[PDB]
Amino acid sequence: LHSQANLMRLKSDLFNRSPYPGPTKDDPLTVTLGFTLQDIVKADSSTNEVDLVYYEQQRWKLNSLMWDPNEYGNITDFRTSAADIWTPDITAYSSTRPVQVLSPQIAVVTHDGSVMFIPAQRLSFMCDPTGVDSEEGATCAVKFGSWVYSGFEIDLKTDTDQVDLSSYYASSKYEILSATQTRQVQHCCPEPYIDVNLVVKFRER
Amino acid sequence: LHSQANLMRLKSDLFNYPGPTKDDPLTVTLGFTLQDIVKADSSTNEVDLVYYEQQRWKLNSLMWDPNEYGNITDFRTSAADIWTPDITAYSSTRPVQVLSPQIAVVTHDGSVMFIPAQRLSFMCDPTGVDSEEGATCAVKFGSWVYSGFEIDLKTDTDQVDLSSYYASSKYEILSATQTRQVQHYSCCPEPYIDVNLVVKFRE
Amino acid sequence: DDDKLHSQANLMRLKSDLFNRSYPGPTKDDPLTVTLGFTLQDIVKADSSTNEVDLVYYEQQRWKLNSLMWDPNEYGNITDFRTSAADIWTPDITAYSSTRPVQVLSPQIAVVTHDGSVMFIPAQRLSFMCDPTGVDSEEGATCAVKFGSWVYSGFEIDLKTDTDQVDLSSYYASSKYEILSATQTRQVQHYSCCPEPYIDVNLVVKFRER
Amino acid sequence: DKLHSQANLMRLKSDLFNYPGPTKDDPLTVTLGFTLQDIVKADSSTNEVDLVYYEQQRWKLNSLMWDPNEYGNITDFRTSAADIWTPDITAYSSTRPVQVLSPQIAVVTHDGSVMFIPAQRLSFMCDPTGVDSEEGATCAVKFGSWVYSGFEIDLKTDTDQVDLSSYYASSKYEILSATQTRQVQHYSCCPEPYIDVNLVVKFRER
Amino acid sequence: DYKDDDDKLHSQANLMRLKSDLFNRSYPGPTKDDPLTVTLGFTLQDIVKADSSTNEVDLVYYEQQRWKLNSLMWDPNEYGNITDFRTSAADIWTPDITAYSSTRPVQVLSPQIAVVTHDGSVMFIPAQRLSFMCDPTGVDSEEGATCAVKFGSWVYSGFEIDLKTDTDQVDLSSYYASSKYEILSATQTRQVQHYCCPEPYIDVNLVVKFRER
Ligand SMILES: C[N+]1(C)[C@@H]2CC[C@H]1C[C@H](n1cc(-c3ccncc3)nn1)C2
């Protein structure tokens, strides 16, 4: 009951008893992105759309979510609804339908102020699967990034350029030949723009 | 009218929980009742199930003495009025579609019974389904964000309840099991728990 | 004309008193009887590849609460009113063998009468478990679906019908399917999960290609 | 000067919004008109046809009247359809929930009249047999209040001719005729009349 | 150092105060006495699908919307030199720009967030998937098919909302190189029409010419 009271007090202190309005040029934020590809579900050659199921790991850190575990019964982290906090507007740049969310929208917040949010998603995106019924397979790509924040407000990075394939569905209609995730910088507008480019080579299993 | 006043007062009292923690872990019991394998798509390797899920847990903070409330021992309430566990399928390919009202039953000892009916599309190769051996598929269910140190999953039985399986389904069930699994990941010492639903079926 | 302004005032006041100055659902001590009746409009689709059939129908629901009673004389002789279904408690009447979420085809509005009775008539499209084998034959196909509370046993919600005959007077005359018979029967239903039975109304439809 | 016109509008909306629907004592008339844009498809396997149209709805409330001279000569304003009461006009033989294609915003005028024009895609019960013949196919669907009788809400049309001037010239289907006709229905049980507008469309493969 | 940390806190406080002063200290939409000009431009990303059985074609594009309100102006010097901010599109008035011949509800593909600048100008760029009325007959030809769809306010006439374009050329620099359909031309043109009614009505007409492969 004390642990419960401690956690409710912590969330009340963080969410009620102090003010974050999003990143700014004077208060920029770095968001780390990683993809865990679970399934290429469908590849449509009549419309050049491919459907992926993946987990999108998002990580950032805010001073305003920091606390001393000693003041709160040594609580070092908690889970909370993603709507309780600010989250980055990371968006697929060439989707062809609204993303469908497959998991609870809940984030893990740690006492250092770091946040980890890992929504599972089904995404339809622009992809010509020509060659998927061949040895070399097909190659397609999709960029992810902020919709409204330039690189002066949100910077992106990956922890690795190799997409996590350890959850890829063993009996998918498609096998993965390779999957990479790479930070890109592009420069109308003075400010740089950042994305992570997800590149997937695949073929019929 | 006195019973109505008592129930309204109980609910006000109770509803005026941050989730479990390592220090205050919660056990959630899970069971499945499979009603129908509706569809098996060999072009996408997606299979569609209709089932309902029994979910049960207990909170001291939902406890009350009936004698203080007209001998009310339980009530029904919107699932939005209370914390519910984030039990999720780990290999769905579409958002789950809910077939039953989001209402749970709370009992005076603090226990909660929630029974969501769902249609689920999940990753499944139906190869063999037109053969004597049939096809076999599996989908894990568990917390999305809590480890086995915060939410422990249990089952009452490893037999999926098939007593309400639709007798004229396109697919007959050869077997269906629900098995608690303890999973570890090389990075971390803490256990993760899921219930693995394994279904063997054929046309 | 001042009469009209007065009637509006009486109704806003009645609604304010009933909703703002005052139902937690039925209990064992205070159980509720819901009357159900179906009006079947159309069998839209019968899918033999998945054994799902799609129905369009109106489901009439009626119940009565003391907490919704008023004296018409205290409120300018208002004897009933329409209100959003979200303003009041409604029963969780659920198809027990749907294969998709029901789709609502009519406004979520109910009629409340001064004796505390409520009438609510949702139009729905429902996909449910049904093997249409035989539909291209003279005998046709037969399927059934139960409707009842999801969370309330017979000790909290009872159901009744006014008739066991489904109303076919609005059935679509150029449907792909003709109705041979449609019945609606109250059942006391025992589930191995639970010592207390649930009440359902069993909708049994015999139909064939027109 | 512009801040004044804005202040006037905001005050008017405030005055007006700071109505329980019609009653037999305070009944209401809704004028309905259809502008048919497209027959998108016809499914002979299910006898469902899909229409795209916008539906003009007009009614008048004393409680929405104001004097333009008291409010900077504001004669009308636009407002979210959620800020006001709107009639529960429903298709009686749809087979899927209507899909709304336009913003849910209405126009309120100083004489208390409200104009709301939802664009919709509708699937409804229709046998397209004959659509590939000179005579074409004929189908119909009634629209009316779901919960209000003719004692609370009357319906009417300005014309019985459906507006076809915006009908898609390259639709897969051409319209031979389209009418919208007020119908009154009485029943021996009940003393109250029931009103609908019957949309009748005759159409043919182009 | 501590000063850098304090600056960031100040910057956050300044933003919260700006948004507070703008929003909950104090737009009812345009009026005949206060007309608004919305600038529209399209960036066409993909013609996904052309259905000859229903004459519906599906587009993916993003639609840049821009307008300017006196009531959204502020002096940057009064707010730590903040010159613009991002905010939820639900925090502010937005124009009801609607496609006039869609056949399904538009599907939104991007975050509903806008950028507000100190001169009171607002920029909002929703990405959308749209199904609209279009006979793709000719798509399998050298000159391709031609389809058009008008965009404009649903409820405001040209008395209250005017439209303009910065160019009549649809932006094709992000068009999907491996689409099933190649673009032959794409234009966006302001029109004044009538429907009966004294008020003139304004739209922007998107005309696309495209063919297979
Ligand atoms: C159709 N049902 C499956 C019947 C009646 C409504 C729905 C849900 C009901 N129900 C109740 C329970 C239950 C209740 C209490 N404890 C364990 C299981 N499980 N399923 C049984």
Ligand SMILES: C[N+]1(C)[C@@H]2CC[C@H]1C[C@H](n1cc(-c3ccncc3)nn1)C2
């Ligand atoms: C595409 N429209 C049909 C144009 C512009 C937006 C939509 C709706 C508009 N509109 C206005 C009216 C109207 C307004 C006032 N009185 C009668 C009809 N009817 N349709 C005309």
